[PDB]
Design an enzyme around this catalytic site. Structure first.
Site, PDB file in Angstrom:
ATOM      1  N   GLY A 196       0.836  -1.180   0.000  1.00  0.00           N
ATOM      2  CA  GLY A 196       0.000   0.000   0.000  1.00  0.00           C
ATOM      3  C   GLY A 196       0.877   1.236   0.000  1.00  0.00           C
ATOM      4  O   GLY A 196       1.979   1.233   0.542  1.00  0.00           O
ATOM      5  N   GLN A 197       0.388   2.296  -0.640  1.00  0.00           N
ATOM      6  CA  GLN A 197       1.136   3.551  -0.628  1.00  0.00           C
ATOM      7  C   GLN A 197       1.075   4.204   0.749  1.00  0.00           C
ATOM      8  O   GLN A 197       2.064   4.226   1.488  1.00  0.00           O
ATOM      9  CB  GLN A 197       0.605   4.509  -1.701  1.00  0.00           C
ATOM     10  CG  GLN A 197       1.364   5.825  -1.726  1.00  0.00           C
ATOM     11  CD  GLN A 197       1.001   6.706  -2.902  1.00  0.00           C
ATOM     12  OE1 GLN A 197       0.156   6.358  -3.730  1.00  0.00           O
ATOM     13  NE2 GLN A 197       1.654   7.855  -2.988  1.00  0.00           N
ATOM     14  N   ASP A 198      -0.093   4.722   1.112  1.00  0.00           N
ATOM     15  CA  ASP A 198      -0.246   5.561   2.283  1.00  0.00           C
ATOM     16  C   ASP A 198      -1.449   5.080   3.080  1.00  0.00           C
ATOM     17  O   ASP A 198      -2.501   4.791   2.498  1.00  0.00           O
ATOM     18  CB  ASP A 198      -0.429   7.027   1.852  1.00  0.00           C
ATOM     19  CG  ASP A 198      -0.101   8.015   2.949  1.00  0.00           C
ATOM     20  OD1 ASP A 198       1.102   8.183   3.247  1.00  0.00           O
ATOM     21  OD2 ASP A 198      -1.037   8.639   3.490  1.00  0.00           O
ATOM     22  N   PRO A 199      -1.336   4.985   4.403  1.00  0.00           N
ATOM     23  CA  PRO A 199      -2.392   4.345   5.197  1.00  0.00           C
ATOM     24  C   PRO A 199      -3.696   5.127   5.139  1.00  0.00           C
ATOM     25  O   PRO A 199      -3.743   6.295   4.745  1.00  0.00           O
ATOM     26  CB  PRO A 199      -1.813   4.339   6.613  1.00  0.00           C
ATOM     27  CG  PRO A 199      -0.854   5.450   6.621  1.00  0.00           C
ATOM     28  CD  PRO A 199      -0.252   5.499   5.254  1.00  0.00           C
ATOM     29  N   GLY A 204      -0.796  11.380   3.029  1.00  0.00           N
ATOM     30  CA  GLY A 204       0.537  11.413   2.464  1.00  0.00           C
ATOM     31  C   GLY A 204       1.451  12.427   3.117  1.00  0.00           C
ATOM     32  O   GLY A 204       1.900  13.374   2.467  1.00  0.00           O
TER      33      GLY A 204
END
Lengths: 271, 82
Positions: free
Chosen positions: A90-93, A167
């Site tokens: 995943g990129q950002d939670p 982000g």
């Protein structure tokens, strides 16, 4: 216990509750011992005290950091790096929360605790599972513990963000996540990495295509489930290459067939 | 401030479920106009009209708005620049 979470029964220590002094440690948060060799490793590194220092400085400020610590390093604390099979990034939670105050963020990617709304990335994932006969009825929940246990390594390329803000901790967790991925690709063997979107692709350039199998497509966000993704190749000689759209790939039907083609107990996805 | 732009622009009182930082060329194929930065795409959902709302801003910490995309069930999406 820590992955089968019910937000209606969500009783976890906060950051300051788990770090009464602003000074933040990470040795505490990591439970499963099969990680220390990597973890001790990254302590020898130089970014690591500055990392705990940045985190402390956030609590000095005093941020509402999510995910709460006792769920940070969760997938690590429940997947030993040996009984792992699939690495999904995943990129950002999840930055949001609930009126109850529970964060969507359960310390792993694309997964939310029980009795909590199912974001549309995860829903578009369920749509895919149904499309390729891996599931009949999309579940009412987004607790992906039954996937983590079976060996699906789901993590965020940035382990923390500040609540409701998106982000924010990239250039903080980059040095951690890169070393993690390098540890995985170098030390261990025949993993399966899944590249959803451009950022996870960027992170999968660091991987050894001689050793591991890599599925690649666009991201399950509604902005992209139907869009191709043009980027580069994996190998040393790159070409301009367009990877398919999330809804045009059997993401989960390639994982199982590869694991079987390497004589590995497959992954029962359905719920 | 992100939850408030969307209301001013659409009257929809909504919250951000998730977000992804995408790249300029990766946006230009969907919007038609190319941004001058990375683009955080913030996602929200409206079950009253059953449709995905998604705000395109600059990357943190500036969060400078760039566009607004509203996408129905069938998946076609209205684009408003900002």
């Amino acid at each position: 216990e820590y992955i089968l979470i019910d937000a209606n029964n969500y009783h976890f220590k906060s950051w300051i509750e788990c770090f009464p002094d602003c000074k933040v440690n990470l040795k505490l948060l990591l439970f499963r011992p099969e990680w220390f060799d990597f973890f001790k490793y990254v302590e020898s590194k130089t970014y690591f005290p500055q990392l705990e220092s940045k985190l402390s400085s956030y609590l000095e400020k005093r941020q509402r950091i999510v995910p709460y610590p006792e769920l940070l390093f969760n997938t690590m604390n429940v997947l030993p790096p040996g009984k792992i099979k699939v690495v999904i990034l995943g990129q950002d939670p999840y930055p949001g929360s609930c009126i109850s105050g529970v964060p969507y963020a359960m310390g792993c990617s694309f997964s939310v605790p029980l009795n909590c709304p199912v974001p549309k990335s995860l829903a578009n994932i369920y749509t895919n599972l149904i499309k390729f006969n891996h599931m009949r009825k999309a579940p009412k929940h987004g607790c992906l513990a039954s996937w983590i246990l079976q060996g699906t390594f789901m993590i965020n390329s940035a382990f923390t963000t500040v609540l409701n803000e998106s982000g924010v901790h990239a250039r903080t967790w980059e040095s951690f996540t890169a070393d993690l991925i390098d540890y995985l690709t170098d030390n261990y063997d025949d993993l399966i990495f899944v590249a959803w979107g451009a950022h996870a692709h960027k992170l999968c350039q660091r991987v050894d295509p001689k050793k591991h199998y890599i599925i690649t497509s666009s991201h399950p966000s509604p902005f992209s489930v139907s869009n191709t993704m043009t980027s580069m190749s994996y190998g040393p000689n790159p070409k301009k290459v367009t990877y398919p759209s999330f809804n045009s790939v059997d993401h989960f039907g390639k994982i199982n067939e590869h694991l079987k083609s390497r004589n590995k107990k497959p992954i029962f996805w359905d719920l | 401030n992100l939850s408030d732009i969307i209301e001013k622009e659409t009257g929809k009182q909504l919250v951000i479920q998730e977000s992804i930082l995408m790249l300029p060329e990766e946006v230009e194929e969907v919007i038609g106009n190319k941004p001058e930065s990375d683009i955080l795409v913030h996602t929200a959902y409206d079950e009253s009209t059953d449709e995905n709302v998604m705000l395109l801003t600059s990357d943190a910490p500036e969060y400078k708005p760039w566009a607004l995309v509203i996408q129905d069930s069938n998946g076609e999406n209205k684009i408003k620049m900002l």
